[PDB]
Coordinates of C-alpha atoms and ligand atoms in Angstrom, one line a residue:
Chain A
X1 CA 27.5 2.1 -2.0
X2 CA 23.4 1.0 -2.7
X3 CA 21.0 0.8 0.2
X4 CA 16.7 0.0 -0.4
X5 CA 13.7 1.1 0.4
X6 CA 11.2 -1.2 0.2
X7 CA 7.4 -0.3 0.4
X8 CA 5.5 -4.2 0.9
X9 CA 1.4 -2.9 0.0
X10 CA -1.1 -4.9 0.4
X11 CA -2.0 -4.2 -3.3
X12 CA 1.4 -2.5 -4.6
X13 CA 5.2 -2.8 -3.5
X14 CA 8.0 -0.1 -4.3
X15 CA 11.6 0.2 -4.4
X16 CA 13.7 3.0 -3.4
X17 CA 17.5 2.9 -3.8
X18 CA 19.9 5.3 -1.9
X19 CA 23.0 5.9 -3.9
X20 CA 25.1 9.3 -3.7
X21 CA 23.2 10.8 -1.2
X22 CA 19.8 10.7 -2.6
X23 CA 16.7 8.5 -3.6
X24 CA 15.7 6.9 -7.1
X25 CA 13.0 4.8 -7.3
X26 CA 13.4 2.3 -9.9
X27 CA 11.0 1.0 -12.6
X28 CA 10.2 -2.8 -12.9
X29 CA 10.5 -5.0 -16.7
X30 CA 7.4 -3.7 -17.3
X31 CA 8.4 0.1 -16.7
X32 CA 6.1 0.8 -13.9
X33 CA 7.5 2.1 -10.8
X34 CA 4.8 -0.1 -8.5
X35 CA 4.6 -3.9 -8.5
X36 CA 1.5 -5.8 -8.2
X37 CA 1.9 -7.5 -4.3
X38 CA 0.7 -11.1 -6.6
X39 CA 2.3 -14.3 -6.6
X40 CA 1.4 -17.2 -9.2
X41 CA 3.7 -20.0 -9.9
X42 CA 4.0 -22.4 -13.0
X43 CA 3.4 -25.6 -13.7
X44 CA 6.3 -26.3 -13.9
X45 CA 6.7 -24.2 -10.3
X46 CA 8.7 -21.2 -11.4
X47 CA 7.5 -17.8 -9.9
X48 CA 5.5 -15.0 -11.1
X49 CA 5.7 -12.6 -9.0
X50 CA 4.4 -9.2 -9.9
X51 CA 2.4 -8.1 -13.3
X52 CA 2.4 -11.3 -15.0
X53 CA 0.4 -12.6 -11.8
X54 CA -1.9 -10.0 -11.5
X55 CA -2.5 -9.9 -15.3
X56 CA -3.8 -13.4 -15.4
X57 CA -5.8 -13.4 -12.6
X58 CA -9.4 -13.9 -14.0
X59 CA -8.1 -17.4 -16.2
X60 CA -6.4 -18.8 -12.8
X61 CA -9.0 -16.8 -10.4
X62 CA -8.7 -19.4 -7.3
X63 CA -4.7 -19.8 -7.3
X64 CA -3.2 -16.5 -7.8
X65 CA -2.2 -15.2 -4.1
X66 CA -2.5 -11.5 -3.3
X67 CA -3.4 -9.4 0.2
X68 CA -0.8 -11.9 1.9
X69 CA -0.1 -8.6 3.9
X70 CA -4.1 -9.2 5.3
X71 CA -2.9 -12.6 7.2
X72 CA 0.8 -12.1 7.4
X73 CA 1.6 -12.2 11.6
X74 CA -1.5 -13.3 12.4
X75 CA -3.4 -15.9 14.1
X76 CA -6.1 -18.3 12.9
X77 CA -9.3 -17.1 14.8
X78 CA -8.4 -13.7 14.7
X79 CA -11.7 -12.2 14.0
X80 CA -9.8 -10.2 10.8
X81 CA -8.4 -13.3 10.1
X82 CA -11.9 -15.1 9.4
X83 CA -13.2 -12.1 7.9
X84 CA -10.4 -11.6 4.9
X85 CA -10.9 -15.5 4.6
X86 CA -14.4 -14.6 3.1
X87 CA -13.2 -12.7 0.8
X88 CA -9.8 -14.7 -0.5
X89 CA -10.8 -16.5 -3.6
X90 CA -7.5 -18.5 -3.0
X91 CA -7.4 -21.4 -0.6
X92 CA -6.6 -20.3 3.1
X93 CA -6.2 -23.1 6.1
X94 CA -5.5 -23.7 9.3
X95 CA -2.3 -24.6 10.9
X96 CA -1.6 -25.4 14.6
X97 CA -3.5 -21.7 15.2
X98 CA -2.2 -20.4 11.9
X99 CA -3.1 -19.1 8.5
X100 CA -1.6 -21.1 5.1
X101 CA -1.9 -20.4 2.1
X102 CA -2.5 -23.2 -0.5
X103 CA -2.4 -23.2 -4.2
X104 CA -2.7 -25.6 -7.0
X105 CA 0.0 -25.9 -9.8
X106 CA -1.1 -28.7 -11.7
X107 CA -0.5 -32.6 -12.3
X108 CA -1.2 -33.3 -8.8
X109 CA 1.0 -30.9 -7.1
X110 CA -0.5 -28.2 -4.2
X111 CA 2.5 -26.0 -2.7
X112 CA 1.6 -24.6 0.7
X113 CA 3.2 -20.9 2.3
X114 CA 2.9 -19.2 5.5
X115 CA 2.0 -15.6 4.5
X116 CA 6.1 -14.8 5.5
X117 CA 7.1 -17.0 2.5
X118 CA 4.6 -15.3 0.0
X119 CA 5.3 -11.5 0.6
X120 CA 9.6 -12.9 0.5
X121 CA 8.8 -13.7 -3.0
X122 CA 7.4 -10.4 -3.8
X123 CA 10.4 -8.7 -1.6
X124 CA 12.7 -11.2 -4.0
X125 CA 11.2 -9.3 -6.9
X126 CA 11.6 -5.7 -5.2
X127 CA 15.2 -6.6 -4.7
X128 CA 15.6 -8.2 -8.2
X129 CA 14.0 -4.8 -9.8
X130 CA 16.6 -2.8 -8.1
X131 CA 19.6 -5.3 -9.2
X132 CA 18.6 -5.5 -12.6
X133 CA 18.7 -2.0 -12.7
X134 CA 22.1 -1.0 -11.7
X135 CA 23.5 -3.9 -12.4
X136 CA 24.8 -5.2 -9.0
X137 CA 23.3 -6.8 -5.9
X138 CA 21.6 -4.8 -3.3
X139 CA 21.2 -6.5 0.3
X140 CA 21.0 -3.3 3.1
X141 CA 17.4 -2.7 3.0
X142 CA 14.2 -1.1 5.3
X143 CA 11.1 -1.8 4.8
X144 CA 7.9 -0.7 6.2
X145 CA 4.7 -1.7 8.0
X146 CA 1.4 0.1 8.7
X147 CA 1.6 1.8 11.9
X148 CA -1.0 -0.3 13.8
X149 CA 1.3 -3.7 13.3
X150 CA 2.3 -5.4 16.4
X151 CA 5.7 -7.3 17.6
X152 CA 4.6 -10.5 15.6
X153 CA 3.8 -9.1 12.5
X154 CA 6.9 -6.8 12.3
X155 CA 9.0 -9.7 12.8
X156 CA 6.6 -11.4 10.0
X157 CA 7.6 -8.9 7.9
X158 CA 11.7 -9.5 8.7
X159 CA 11.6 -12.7 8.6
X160 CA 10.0 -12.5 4.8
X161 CA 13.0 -10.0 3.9
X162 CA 15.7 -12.7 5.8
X163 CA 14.2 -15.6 3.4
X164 CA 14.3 -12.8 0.5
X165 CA 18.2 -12.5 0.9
X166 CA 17.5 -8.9 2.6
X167 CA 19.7 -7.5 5.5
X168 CA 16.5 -6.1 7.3
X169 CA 18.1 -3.2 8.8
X170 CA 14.8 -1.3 10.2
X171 CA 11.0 -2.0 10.1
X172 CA 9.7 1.5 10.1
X173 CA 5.9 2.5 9.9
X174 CA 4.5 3.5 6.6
X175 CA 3.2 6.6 7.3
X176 CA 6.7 8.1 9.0
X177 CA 7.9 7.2 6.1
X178 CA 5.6 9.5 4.1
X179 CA 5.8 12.4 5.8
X180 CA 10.1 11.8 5.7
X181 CA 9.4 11.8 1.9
X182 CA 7.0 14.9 2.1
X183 CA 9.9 16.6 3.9
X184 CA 7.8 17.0 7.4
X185 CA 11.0 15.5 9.4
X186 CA 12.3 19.1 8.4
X187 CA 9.6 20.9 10.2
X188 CA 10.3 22.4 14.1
X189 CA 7.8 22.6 17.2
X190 CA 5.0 20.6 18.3
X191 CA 2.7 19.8 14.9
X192 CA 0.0 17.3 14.1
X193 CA -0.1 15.3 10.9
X194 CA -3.1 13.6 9.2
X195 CA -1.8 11.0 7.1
X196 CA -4.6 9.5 4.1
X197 CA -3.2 6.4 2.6
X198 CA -5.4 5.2 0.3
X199 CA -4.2 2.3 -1.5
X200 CA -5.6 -0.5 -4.2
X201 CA -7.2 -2.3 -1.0
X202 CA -7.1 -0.9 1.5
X203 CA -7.7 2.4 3.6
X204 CA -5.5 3.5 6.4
X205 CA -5.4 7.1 8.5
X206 CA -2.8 7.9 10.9
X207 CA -2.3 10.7 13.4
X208 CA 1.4 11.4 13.5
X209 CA 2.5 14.0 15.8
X210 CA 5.8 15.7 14.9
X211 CA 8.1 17.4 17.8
X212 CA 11.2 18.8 17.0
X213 CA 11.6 16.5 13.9
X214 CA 10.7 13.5 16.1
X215 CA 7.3 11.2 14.9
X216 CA 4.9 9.7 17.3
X217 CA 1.7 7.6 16.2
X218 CA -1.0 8.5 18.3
X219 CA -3.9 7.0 16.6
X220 CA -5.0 5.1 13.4
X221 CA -8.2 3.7 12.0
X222 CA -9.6 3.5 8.0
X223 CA -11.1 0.7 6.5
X224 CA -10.0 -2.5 5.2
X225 CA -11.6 -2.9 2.5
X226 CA -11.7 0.2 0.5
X227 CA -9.4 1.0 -1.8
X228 CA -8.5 1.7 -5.9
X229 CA -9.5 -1.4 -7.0
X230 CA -13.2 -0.8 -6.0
X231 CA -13.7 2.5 -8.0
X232 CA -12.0 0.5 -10.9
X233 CA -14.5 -2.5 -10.2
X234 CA -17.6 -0.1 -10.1
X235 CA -16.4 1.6 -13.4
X236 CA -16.0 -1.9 -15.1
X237 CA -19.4 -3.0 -13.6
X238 CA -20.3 -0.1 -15.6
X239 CA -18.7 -1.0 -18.8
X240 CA -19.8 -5.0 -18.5
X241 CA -23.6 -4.0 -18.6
X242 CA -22.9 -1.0 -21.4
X243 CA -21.4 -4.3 -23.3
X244 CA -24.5 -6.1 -22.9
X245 CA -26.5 -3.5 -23.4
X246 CA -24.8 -3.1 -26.6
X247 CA -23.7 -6.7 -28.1
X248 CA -26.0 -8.7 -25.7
X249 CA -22.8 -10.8 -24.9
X250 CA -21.5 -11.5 -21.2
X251 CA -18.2 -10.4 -21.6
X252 CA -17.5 -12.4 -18.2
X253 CA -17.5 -15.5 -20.5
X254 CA -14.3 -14.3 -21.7
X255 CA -12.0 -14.2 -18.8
X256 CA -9.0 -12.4 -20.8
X257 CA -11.8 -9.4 -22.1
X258 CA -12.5 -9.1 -18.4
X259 CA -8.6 -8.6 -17.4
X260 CA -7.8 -6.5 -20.8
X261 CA -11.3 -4.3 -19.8
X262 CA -9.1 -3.8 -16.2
X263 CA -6.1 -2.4 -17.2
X264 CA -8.2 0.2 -19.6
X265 CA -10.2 1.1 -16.6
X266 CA -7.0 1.7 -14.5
X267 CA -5.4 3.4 -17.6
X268 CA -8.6 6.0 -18.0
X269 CA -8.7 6.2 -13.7
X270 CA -5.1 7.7 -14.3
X271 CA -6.4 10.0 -17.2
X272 CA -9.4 11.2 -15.8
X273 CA -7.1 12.9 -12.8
X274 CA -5.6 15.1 -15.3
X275 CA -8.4 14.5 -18.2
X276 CA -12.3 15.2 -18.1
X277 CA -12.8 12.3 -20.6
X278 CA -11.0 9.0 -21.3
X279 CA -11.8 5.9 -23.7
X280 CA -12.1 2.2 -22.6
X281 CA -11.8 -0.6 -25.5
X282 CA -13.3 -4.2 -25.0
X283 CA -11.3 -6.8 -27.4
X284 CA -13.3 -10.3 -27.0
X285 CA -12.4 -13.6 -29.0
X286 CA -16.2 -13.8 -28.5
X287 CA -17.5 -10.9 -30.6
X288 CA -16.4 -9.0 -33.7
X289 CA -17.1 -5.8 -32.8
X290 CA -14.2 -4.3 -30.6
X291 CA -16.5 -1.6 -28.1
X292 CA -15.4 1.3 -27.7
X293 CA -16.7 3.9 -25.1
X294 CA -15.9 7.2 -23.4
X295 CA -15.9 7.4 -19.6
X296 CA -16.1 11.3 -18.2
X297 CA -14.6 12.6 -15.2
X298 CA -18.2 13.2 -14.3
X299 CA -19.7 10.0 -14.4
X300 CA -16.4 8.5 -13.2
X301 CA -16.7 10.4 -10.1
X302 CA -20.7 10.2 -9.8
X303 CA -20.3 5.9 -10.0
X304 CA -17.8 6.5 -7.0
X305 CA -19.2 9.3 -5.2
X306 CA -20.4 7.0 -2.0
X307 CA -17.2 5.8 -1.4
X308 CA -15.1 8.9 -2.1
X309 CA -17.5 10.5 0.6
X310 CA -17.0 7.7 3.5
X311 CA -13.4 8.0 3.4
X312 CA -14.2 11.1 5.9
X313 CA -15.5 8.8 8.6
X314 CA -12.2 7.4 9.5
X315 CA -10.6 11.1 9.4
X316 CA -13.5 11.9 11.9
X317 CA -12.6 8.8 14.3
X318 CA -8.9 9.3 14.2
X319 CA -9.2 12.7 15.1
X320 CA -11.4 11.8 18.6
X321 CA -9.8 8.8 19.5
X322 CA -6.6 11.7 19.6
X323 CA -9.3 14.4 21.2
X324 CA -7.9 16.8 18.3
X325 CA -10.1 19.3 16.2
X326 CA -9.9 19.3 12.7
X327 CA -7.8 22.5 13.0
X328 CA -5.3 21.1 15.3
X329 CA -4.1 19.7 11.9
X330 CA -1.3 21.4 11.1
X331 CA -0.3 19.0 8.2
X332 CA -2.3 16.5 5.5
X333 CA -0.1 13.6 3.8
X334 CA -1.3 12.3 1.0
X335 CA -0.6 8.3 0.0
X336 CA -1.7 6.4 -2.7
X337 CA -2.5 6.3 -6.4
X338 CA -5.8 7.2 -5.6
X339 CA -5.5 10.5 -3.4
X340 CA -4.7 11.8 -7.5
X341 CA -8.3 11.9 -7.7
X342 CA -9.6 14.9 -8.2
X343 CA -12.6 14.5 -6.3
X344 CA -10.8 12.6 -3.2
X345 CA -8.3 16.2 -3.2
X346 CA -11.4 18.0 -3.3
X347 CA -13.0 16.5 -0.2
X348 CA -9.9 16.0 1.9
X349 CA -9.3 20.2 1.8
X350 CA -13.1 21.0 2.0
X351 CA -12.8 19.0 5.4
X352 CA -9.6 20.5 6.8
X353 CA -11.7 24.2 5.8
X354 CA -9.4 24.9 2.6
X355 CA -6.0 23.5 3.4
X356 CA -3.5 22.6 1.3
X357 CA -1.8 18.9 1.2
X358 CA 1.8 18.1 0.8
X359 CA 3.0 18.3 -2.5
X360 CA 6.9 17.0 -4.5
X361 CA 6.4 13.3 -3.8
X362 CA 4.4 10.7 -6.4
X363 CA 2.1 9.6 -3.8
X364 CA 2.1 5.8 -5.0
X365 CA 6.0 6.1 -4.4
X366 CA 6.5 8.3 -1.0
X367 CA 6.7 4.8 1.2
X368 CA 9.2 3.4 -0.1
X369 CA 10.9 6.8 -0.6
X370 CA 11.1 7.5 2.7
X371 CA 12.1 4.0 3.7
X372 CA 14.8 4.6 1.3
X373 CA 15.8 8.0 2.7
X374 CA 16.2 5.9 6.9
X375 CA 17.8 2.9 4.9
X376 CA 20.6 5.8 3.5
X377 CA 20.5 7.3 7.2
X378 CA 20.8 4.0 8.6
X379 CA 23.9 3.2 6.6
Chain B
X1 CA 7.0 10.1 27.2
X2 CA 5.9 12.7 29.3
X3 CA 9.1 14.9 28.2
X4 CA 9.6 16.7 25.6
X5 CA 12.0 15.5 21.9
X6 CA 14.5 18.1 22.8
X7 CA 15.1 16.9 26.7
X8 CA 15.2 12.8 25.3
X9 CA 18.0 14.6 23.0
X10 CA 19.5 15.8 25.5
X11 CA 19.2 12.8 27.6
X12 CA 21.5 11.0 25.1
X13 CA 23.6 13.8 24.5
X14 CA 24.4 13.8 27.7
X15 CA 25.9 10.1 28.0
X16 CA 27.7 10.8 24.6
X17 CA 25.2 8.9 22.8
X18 CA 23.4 9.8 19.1
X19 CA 20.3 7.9 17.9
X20 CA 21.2 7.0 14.4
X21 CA 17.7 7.2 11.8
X22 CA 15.7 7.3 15.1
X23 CA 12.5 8.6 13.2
X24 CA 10.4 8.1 16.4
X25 CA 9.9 9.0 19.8
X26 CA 9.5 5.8 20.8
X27 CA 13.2 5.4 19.4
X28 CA 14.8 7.8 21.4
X29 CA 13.3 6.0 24.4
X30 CA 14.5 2.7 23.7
X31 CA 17.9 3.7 23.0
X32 CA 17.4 6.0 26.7
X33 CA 16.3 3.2 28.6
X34 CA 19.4 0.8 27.3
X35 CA 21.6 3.4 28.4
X36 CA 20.0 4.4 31.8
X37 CA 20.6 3.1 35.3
X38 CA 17.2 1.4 36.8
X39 CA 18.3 -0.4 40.1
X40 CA 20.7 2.4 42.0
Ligands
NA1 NA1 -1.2 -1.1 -1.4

């Protein structure tokens, strides 16, 4: 008997299987335990769904869909809505009220998706990981939202795991899930939870309450549109003018350096939480010299420093809006790649006056974790 | 919502009723109001 977990990110997805009474979260064909939330297709109009997407991004820049969760149960003039649009570099149009998503192929051919048919693929791909795996076909699945989604987009979110071949037994809210993982479901009286999810995207802050072992979201805020990605883009901003400083090249001319430069910016970003120094490489067809530079921890965390500090200012609102003190926190969550950073773990207990997060859980996989832990209770 | 967990626990428990993976509050007072008489 196999039931899943499935974490849908706007960024990164995760798969959680249930099987003899406990969770595994299982590793993809590229033997990472987080898939890219990216869809490409073919021209011959196959799928890619996953790494191969988001690793060819920069050569196929305007028809590689990602942040589908951004649209996905929303309307057309919804203000978010017209704002995200700004910042697709994919085509996005209107529907009868509604946001489509439109991609070119090639040879004349332009496939259209609501936002439900582009995050089924990527649940396809979750539920494919898991199969191809342990070698049998899951269906009995949860899979979560971020606490602030309405009616609409929860049933957005079904009906992409219905087209996906999912039983959707439960849409649960992400950050329940996280504290389930974290073990706070085990924890008796009346206790407030600050949960910091700060994902490739997107930032999000919830105020859980917990009452004897019972959730309740009180309040949420963060911001849209901060996340991993932009301390990753601000270190390879970094290392693109180093590179012309150095060679005089623009190694944006060479759209594969650019996507190569990425993943050894996210590869030294993972270092430098356990490291104080890290190398990045740029290969180029364009140059013969293969560069070749060290990145500190330091400088890492002085390029980022802004945006590591204003992720206090949604901890600040959420905790108002609830008419809570900062020590009427009783627990801190922790979600996210990201909250690895030293510096993030640094400010988040300096805030809360020296306490300590929740720790046992990779934070990039306690979502889907915990959806997988309700999908076993569930079953 | 005014009452406590343990009383909406009790609630069900007292019309021989368990809320199965009911991670919220908001859980427990679905499955309540299903169960409860409205129009005596
Ligand atoms: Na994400």
């Amino acid at each position: 008997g196999t039931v899943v977990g499935i974490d849908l990110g706007t960024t990164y997805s995760c798969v959680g299987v249930f099987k003899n009474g406990r969770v595994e979260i299982i590793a993809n064909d590229q033997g990472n335990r987080i898939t890219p939330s990216y869809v490409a297709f073919t021209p011959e109009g196959e799928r890619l769904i996953g790494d191969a997407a988001k690793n060819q991004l920069t050569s196929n820049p305007e028809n590689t869909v990602f942040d589908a969760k951004r649209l996905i149960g929303r309307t057309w003039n919804d203000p978010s809505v017209q704002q995200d649009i700004k910042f697709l570099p994919f085509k996005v149009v209107e529907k009868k009220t509604k946001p489509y998503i439109q991609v070119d192929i090639g040879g004349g051919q332009t496939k259209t998706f609501a936002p439900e048919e582009i995050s089924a693929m990527v649940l396809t791909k979750m539920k494919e990981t898991a199969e191809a795996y342990l070698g049998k076909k899951v269906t009995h699945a949860v899979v979560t939202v971020p606490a602030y989604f309405n009616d609409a987009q929860r049933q957005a979110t079904k009906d992409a795991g219905t087209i996906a071949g999912l039983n959707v037994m439960r849409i649960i809210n992400e950050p329940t899930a996280a504290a389930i993982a974290y073990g706070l479901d085990k924890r008796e009286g009346e206790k407030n939870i600050l949960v910091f999810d700060l994902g490739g995207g997107t930032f999000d802050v919830s105020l859980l309450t917990i009452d004897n072992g019972v959730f309740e979201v009180v309040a949420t805020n963060g911001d849209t549109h901060l996340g991993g990605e932009d301390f990753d883009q601000r270190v390879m901003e970094h290392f693109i003018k180093l590179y012309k400083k150095k060679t005089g090249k623009d190694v944006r001319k060479d759209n594969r350096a650019v996507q190569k430069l990425r993943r050894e910016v996210e590869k030294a970003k993972r270092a430098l939480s356990s490291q104080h120094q890290a190398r990045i490489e740029i290969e180029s067809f364009f140059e013969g010299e293969d560069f070749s530079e060290t990145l500190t921890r330091a400088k890492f965390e002085e390029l980022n420093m802004d945006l590591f500090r204003s992720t206090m200012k949604p901890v600040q609102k959420v905790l108002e809006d609830s008419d809570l003190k900062k020590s009427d926190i009783d627990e801190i969550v922790l979600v996210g790649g990201s909250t690895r950073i030293p510096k993030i773990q640094q400010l988040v207990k300096e805030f809360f006056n020296g306490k300590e997060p929740s720790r046992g859980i990779n934070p990039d996989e306690a979502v889907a974790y915990g959806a997988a832990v309700q999908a076993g209770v569930l079953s | 919502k005014k009452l406590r967990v343990k009383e909406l626990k009790k609630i069900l428990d007292d019309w021989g009723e368990m809320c199965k993976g009911c991670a919220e509050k908001s859980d427990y007072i679905r499955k309540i109001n299903e169960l409860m008489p409205k129009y005596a």
